[PDB]
């Protein structure tokens, strides 16, 4: 099993990006990860329209070219966003209609192109055309008011000027089947397709949150557009809240469907989030790795050969037999945990959640007051801290989120009594869990 | 007199008090929200050794005549914090030692006692002057080096520079009563008290996390203590994830015993306090009242005509006398939640966490998808958002922390399929529920 989100997607001849911001590559924690994880990836700002063409005519590439020769210099390809969108357009661009909008979009289409020919992988040609009012129809914008066929010339322009790059088109909430706009789109590329529009790739944005939420169904519209001919990408993937099994579960879609390029999650670090409130990506802003995270790369892999227990569960130590127990079925705060023969007892009983906590007695967390080794693990009423989340690794370890240290059987200890404790990682048979 | 923490305090002739920082006076978020909830008030930092006498033999009390000014002028008493203390000394003071600094200590206290006297409701003369060692020993400072005296000396002090003042030994990890520094402090208040000692009063910090957590012997060491003759103070209460058990479990300790004058939060909103990171407060960042909130303010008023469940329950409405209902029993993200008749199933089975959430099926949230009036409520998996937060208050209404709106059977609504939303709270029958 490949140890990084890129090396584990590539395994079924995939990739998984990040959007990276240019501000941040001078952080070695952001660029550690970033090198580390990803094969692929996107400018979350430095190749939109503004960013690239900042007077009409006047074309600016410093800024997308800092991203693009970082990602090239750590192996990664490159998705091009964005060329036509009615957003973050310049204060030129704002101001044209009609004709003149109409060929300064064709203008900056064959500019940044040009500029980036041979050199991009994907590009988001038009972004987000499509309203969220329900009707299925265009979004009412400068572009569109230039005709109908905005798009269709986008996409005509844009094979002319780079015939080496897929051409996408990217949108947001046309995840779930049952959605008007999600239909709109689908009518446009099959349109496209069947009149020979130069379409090579539809970009599913995946913002998901409790608003609009991911739904399973989202395989069926994965499916329905790779019928067109098209190829399908995962294209900003964001998870409000990052359940561990709404990120695998998207994973798996992509990797169920063989049109499906890859997956581009939205940022690296929480904190580096357009959403950091919704803390919707796979690392943390202390840099380590997220419940999620292990899930996302356990999904690349192929998953495991039996399911996780749904509920409940006992935690065995491989090591000693025994299970991970609360000393004589206490529910007081600060108890240190320990071995002992498993039985049926609820102070055994733990449910690992979406969130990654290791929950016992319904709302006590399996908890660490430090981030050293010799920190007792013990139990503590659940809150959330990063102290309380852990990560079910492959190899049967489980690892705090915070400390990023192994849960481990004090001194080898195999006897009913043996305390827990947090210790550097060793693949030991002390640090060893079965789910059974 | 019961719809604010101060005033359901006074009922039994007690206070809810917290600390100011005066630079926050300006910002009317902060002071709408103090001004209100507090009638006694401690000034973070401002009557500090420090603060006040920033070089030898000059006293400036500008900032902390701020503070005692506000909080007067609000309806509030006053705790002094604090006059002799190792810990923000003065460059100058921490230089010192022997008999130079004895004799410093005493005049800093006459000082500012002098200046407030017969203001202040208690002072914390000395602060945290045992160790963490676990010998139950003096901790090692410029001040215990002056000889092992200081602290009675301090106290004679005090007494003699204004008589009217209650005079407090405050300290941090003695409310255990099985720990050594716990001991060693009570050891200490027993034989002054014998002798004739002028203390009145011992501060217990409270600064509970799962490090240090709070233990249920917590009311047994302040009706210890307060067997001795004093009376008892929780002086700077802030809990590691704010437990809403925990903090109506503190609350009802001080209600347990008579001479617990009553409790102060170190702060208002988790963005003031000095431990943001682990939103330790009663309330949000963004000013809105946290699950603990309501849980410290229906203990104050009295609890509940009943105990609070205890976790797998229904939440019957009042006004249809149906049952808050998932959908088929889905536990698919985004299903909204309606009445229907009830029954035993998993389904109906509501668990409130400390964390303020609605679980059901174990892993799933009452979730709200926004934070206007007509927003959905639906199940979505757990995360910790504010969304996923709700306050059971005493009327019977469930309210949304990050919205501040109430659960809500559409239209009026009593029919099963009824679906439930967000909607500001008008105690009709149809926001009022019942978990007996
Ligand atoms: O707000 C700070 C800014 O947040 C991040 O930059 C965001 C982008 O992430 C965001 O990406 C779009 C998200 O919605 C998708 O549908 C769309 O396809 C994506 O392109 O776009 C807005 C951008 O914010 C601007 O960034 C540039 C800055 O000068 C502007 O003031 C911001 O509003 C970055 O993490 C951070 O810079
Ligand atoms: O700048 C951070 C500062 O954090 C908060 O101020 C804290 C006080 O809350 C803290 O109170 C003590 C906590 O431990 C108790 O045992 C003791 O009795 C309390 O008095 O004391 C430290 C103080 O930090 C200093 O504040 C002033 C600043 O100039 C210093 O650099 C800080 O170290 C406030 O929320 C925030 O201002
Ligand atoms: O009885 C007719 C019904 O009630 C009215 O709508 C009420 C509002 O009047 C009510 O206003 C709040 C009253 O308490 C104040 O403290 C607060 O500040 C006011 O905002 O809020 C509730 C609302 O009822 C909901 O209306 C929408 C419906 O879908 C919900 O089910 C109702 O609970 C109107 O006459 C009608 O709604
Ligand atoms: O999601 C809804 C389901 O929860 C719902 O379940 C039915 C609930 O009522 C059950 O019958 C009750 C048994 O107890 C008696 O006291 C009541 O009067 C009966 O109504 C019924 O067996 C369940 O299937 O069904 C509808 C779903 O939308
Ligand atoms: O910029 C875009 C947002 O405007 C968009 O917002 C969505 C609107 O519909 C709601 O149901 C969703 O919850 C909300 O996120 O999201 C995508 C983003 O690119
Ligand atoms: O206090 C001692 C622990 O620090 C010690 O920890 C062990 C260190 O080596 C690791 O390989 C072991 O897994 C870990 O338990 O154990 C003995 C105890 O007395
Ligand atoms: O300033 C004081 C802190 O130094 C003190 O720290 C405590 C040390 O023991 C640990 O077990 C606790 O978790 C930790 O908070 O806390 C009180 C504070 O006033
Ligand atoms: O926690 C242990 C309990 O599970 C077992 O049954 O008896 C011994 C205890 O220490």
């Not at 140890?3 to 998984?16: D, E, H, I, N, V």
């Not at 800024?63 to 973050?88: C, E, F, I, M, P």
């Not at 706009?181 to 970009?203: A, E, H, L, S």
């Amino acid at each position: 099993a490949e140890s990084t989100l890129g090396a584990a997607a590539a395994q079924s001849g995939r990739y998984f990006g990040t959007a990276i911001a240019s501000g941040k590559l001078g952080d070695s924690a952001y660029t550690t990860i970033a090198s580390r994880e990803f094969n692929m990836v996107t400018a979350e700002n430095e190749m939109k329209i503004d960013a690239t063409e900042p007077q009409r005519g006047q074309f600016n590439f410093s800024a997308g070219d800092r991203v693009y020769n970082w990602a090239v210099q750590n192996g990664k390809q490159v998705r091009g966003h964005t060329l036509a969108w009615h957003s973050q357009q310049p204060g030129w661009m704002q101001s044209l209609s009609g004709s003149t909008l109409r060929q300064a979009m064709i203008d900056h289409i064959n500019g940044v192109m040009g500029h980036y020919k041979g050199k991009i992988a994907q590009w988001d040609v038009v972004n987000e055309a499509f309203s969220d009012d329900g009707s299925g129809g265009r979004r009412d914008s400068n572009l569109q008011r230039t005709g109908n066929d905005w798009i269709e010339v986008a996409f005509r322009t844009a094979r002319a000027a780079d015939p080496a790059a897929k051409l996408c088109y990217n949108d947001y909430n046309i995840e779930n089947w049952t959605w008007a706009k999600t239909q709109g789109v689908y009518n446009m590329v099959r349109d496209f397709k069947q009149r020979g529009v130069p379409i090579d790739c539809v970009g599913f944005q995946s913002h998901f949150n409790s608003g609009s939420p991911y739904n399973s169904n989202f395989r069926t519209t994965l499916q329905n557009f790779a019928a067109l001919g098209v190829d399908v990408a995962i294209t900003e993937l964001d998870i409000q809240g990052a359940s561990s099994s709404t990120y695998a579960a998207v994973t798996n879609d992509c990797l169920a469907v063989s049109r499906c390029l890859g997956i581009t999650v939205w940022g690296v670090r929480d904190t580096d989030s357009w959403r950091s409130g919704d803390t919707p990506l796979l690392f943390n802003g202390d840099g380590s790795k997220k419940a999620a995270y292990t899930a996302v790369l356990n999904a690349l892999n192929g998953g495991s050969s039996t399911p996780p227990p749904s509920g409940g569960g006992q935690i065995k130590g491989v090591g000693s037999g025994r299970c991970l127990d609360v000393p004589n079925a206490s529910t007081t705060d600060g108890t240190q945990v320990q071995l002992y023969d498993c039985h049926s007892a609820t102070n055994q009983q733990w449910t690992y959640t979406d969130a990654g906590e290791l929950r016992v007695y319904g709302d006590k967390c399996l908890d660490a007051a430090g981030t050293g080794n010799g920190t007792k693990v013990q139990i503590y009423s659940c809150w959330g801290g990063d102290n309380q989340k852990w990560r079910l690794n492959s190899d049967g370890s489980i690892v705090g989120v915070q400390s990023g240290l192994c849960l481990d059987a004090v001194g080898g200890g195999t006897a009913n009594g043996t305390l827990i404790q947090l210790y550097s990682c060793s693949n030991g048979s002390n640090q060893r869990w079965t789910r059974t």
